[PDB]
C-alpha cells in the first residue's frame, strides 16, 4: 500500500539551513514525479514544484525557483526539499505528494498519495519575557451588570505563557486568549476576567503571568482607571 | 491567468446540498483537467474528484463535480458533520507553456453543529503604564461567535485604519464557539490626537462596534 512518510517538525532560526525528507513505499520510486506543496498558517495550499527521481528532472513554480531546492536519494527512496537560508516567511506546513492517479496505461496527472506533512517554524527573535500591563475596568458604577478587566501580556518569545488570577482562586469568567504573532517575531496575548461591578472597591484582582523560557514571573494589580 | 478563485466560506446544515465554486481562466479550468481535494484537520489533502467529474475510488457518491466554461463546481449532497473542512479545486495551467499546477484559494465549509452566535466584543484602550513606556496598544477581544469567521475593521475617529493592525485566526473555544483578538499599535502621539478609536467586528452580516477615547 503506497505511503509517503515525511520527517518531523522543525524549529529553526532565520538564516539557518534545513533539509526535509519524504520517504516512499509501495511503488517504483524512480518512476513517478514527487511534488511539494506549502501551507502558511491560516492560508491555503500552494504548489512549489515537481521533481522526477529517475533522471533528476524538475519544475519549480515561479515563486519558488531559486528559493528552494528539490532533490532525491535513490539509494533510500527519499525525496528532499532544502533551504540554505531560512526566512521567517518559510514558516509553514510542507507536504510531499506523488503525481499519479494511474487513470491510463501511461502518464500521471493528479497528486494521489500524500505525506502527513512536516511543520517548519522559523523565527528571527530570541528568548524574551513579556511586559505585562493591566487592562483597567471600563468604568466603575455602570448599572448594566458585570465588568471586564484584564492583563495585556506583551512581546515575549517563545510560547507558551501561563496566566492565572488571584493565584488560581479566581477562575470564573476568566478568558485567556491565544497569542498573536507579530511581524517582529514576538508574541502578545490577553487574559480577561468577567466580574461583578459592585466588588471593584472590594476584591483585589492580580494576574499571575509565568513565562518559563525566560524564567519570568510577574504579578500585576488591575485597578479602576483614574 | 494562473488563478483559481473560490469563495472563502460556505455553510450548510446536516442533510443539505451545497455547491463549492471555483473560477479559473482559459489557461486552466476551461480546457485542462480539474481536480478536487478535501482537507480536514490532522489529515493530508485528499483527492475527491479527478478529470473534471470522475469520483476517486472509495469516495462516497454524494460527492459530484461538473464543468462549464471557466467555472467548476463540487456538489456535496447529504451534508454530514464529517464534511466540515477546506475544499480546493485544482488544475494544470499552461500560461508559461508548461505544466504548472495551481490550487484554488480554498473554501472553508462549515457544517452547522449548533445555533449561530453573535460575537462579544470588548475593547481596552492603552494602559497608562504602557503609555509611560512610550507605547500604545488597543486590544480588541472577540468571543463566542459561531460559525468561526469574523472580519475586523479599525477606525481612527470615523476613518479606516490599515497600518499597525495585527489580528489572530479564530480558534475554537472549549464550548465549540470561536474566539479571536485584534491588536492595533500606535505611538502615543497617534492615540492622543484623535477623538476616538473603534473596533468593528462583523459576523454573518451583523456588525458589533466598540469605541474608546483618551480619558
Amino acid at each position: 500500500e503506497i505511503q509517503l512518510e515525511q520527517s518531523g517538525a522543525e524549529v529553526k532560526k532565520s538564516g539557518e539551513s534545513l533539509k526535509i525528507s519524504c520517504q516512499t513505499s509501495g511503488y517504483s520510486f524512480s518512476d513517478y514525479w514527487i511534488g511539494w506543496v506549502r501551507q502558511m498558517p491560516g492560508k491555503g495550499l500552494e504548489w512549489m514544484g515537481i521533481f522526477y527521481p529517475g533522471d533528476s528532472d524538475s519544475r519549480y513554480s515561479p515563486s519558488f525557483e531559486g528559493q528552494v531546492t528539490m532533490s532525491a536519494d535513490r539509494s533510500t527512496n527519499t525525496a528532499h526539499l532544502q533551504w540554505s537560508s531560512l526566512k521567517p516567511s518559510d514558516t509553514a506546513l510542507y507536504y510531499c505528494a506523488r503525481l499519479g492517479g494511474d487513470y491510463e496505461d501511461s502518464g500521471a496527472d493528479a497528486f494521489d498519495f500524500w505525506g502527513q506533512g512536516t511543520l517548519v517554524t522559523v523565527s528571527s527573535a530570541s528568548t524574551k519575557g513579556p511586559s505585562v500591563f493591566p487592562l483597567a475596568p471600563s468604568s466603575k458604577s455602570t448599572s448594566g451588570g458585570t465588568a471586564a478587566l484584564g492583563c495585556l501580556v506583551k512581546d515575549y518569545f517563545p510560547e507558551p505563557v501561563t496566566v492565572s488570577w488571584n493565584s488560581g482562586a479566581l477562575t470564573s469568567g476568566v478568558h485567556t486568549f491565544p497569542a498573536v504573532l507579530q511581524s517582529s517575531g514576538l508574541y502578545s496575548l490577553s487574559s480577561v476576567v468577567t466580574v461583578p461591578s459592585s466588588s471593584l472597591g472590594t476584591q483585589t484582582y492580580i494576574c499571575n503571568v509565568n513565562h518559563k523560557p525566560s524564567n519570568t514571573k510577574v504579578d500585576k494589580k488591575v485597578e479602576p482607571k483614574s | 491567468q494562473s488563478v483559481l478563485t473560490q469563495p472563502p466560506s460556505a455553510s450548510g446544515t446536516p442533510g443539505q446540498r451545497i455547491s463549492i465554486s471555483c473560477s479559473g481562466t482559459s489557461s486552466n479550468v476551461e480546457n485542462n483537467y480539474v481536480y478536487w481535494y478535501q482537507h480536514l484537520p490532522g489529515t493530508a489533502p485528499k483527492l475527491l474528484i479527478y478529470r473534471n467529474d470522475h469520483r476517486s475510488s472509495g469516495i462516497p457518491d454524494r460527492f459530484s463535480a461538473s464543468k462549464s466554461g471557466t467555472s467548476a463546481s463540487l456538489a456535496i449532497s447529504g451534508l454530514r458533520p464529517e464534511d466540515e473542512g477546506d475544499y480546493y479545486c485544482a488544475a494544470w495551467d499552461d500560461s508559461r507553456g508548461g505544466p504548472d499546477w495551481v490550487f484554488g484559494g480554498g473554501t472553508k465549509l462549515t457544517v452547522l453543529a449548533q445555533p449561530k452566535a453573535a460575537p462579544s466584543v470588548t475593547l481596552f484602550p492603552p494602559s497608562s503604564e504602557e503609555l509611560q513606556a512610550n507605547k500604545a496598544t488597543l486590544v480588541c477581544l472577540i468571543s463566542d461567535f459561531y460559525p468561526g469567521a469574523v472580519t475586523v475593521a479599525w477606525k481612527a475617529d470615523s476613518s479606516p485604519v490599515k497600518a499597525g493592525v495585527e489580528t489572530t485566526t479564530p480558534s475554537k473555544q472549549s464550548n465549540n464557539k470561536y474566539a479571536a483578538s485584534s491588536y492595533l499599535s500606535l505611538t502615543p502621539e497617534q492615540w492622543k490626537s484623535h477623538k476616538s478609536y473603534s473596533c468593528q467586528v462583523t459576523h454573518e452580516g451583523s456588525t458589533v462596534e466598540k469605541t474608546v477615547a483618551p480619558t
Binding site: 518512476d31 529517475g54 528532472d57 503525481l99 502518464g107 500521471a108 | 485542462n32 505544466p99
Partner: peptide, 16 residues
C-alpha cells in the same frame, strides 16, 4: 512511463 503529465484530453507534457 509515468513521467508524462496529462494536462487535458489529448494533451501532455514530457511525452515520448
Amino acid at each position: 512511463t509515468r513521467k508524462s503529465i496529462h494536462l487535458g484530453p489529448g494533451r501532455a507534457f514530457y511525452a515520448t
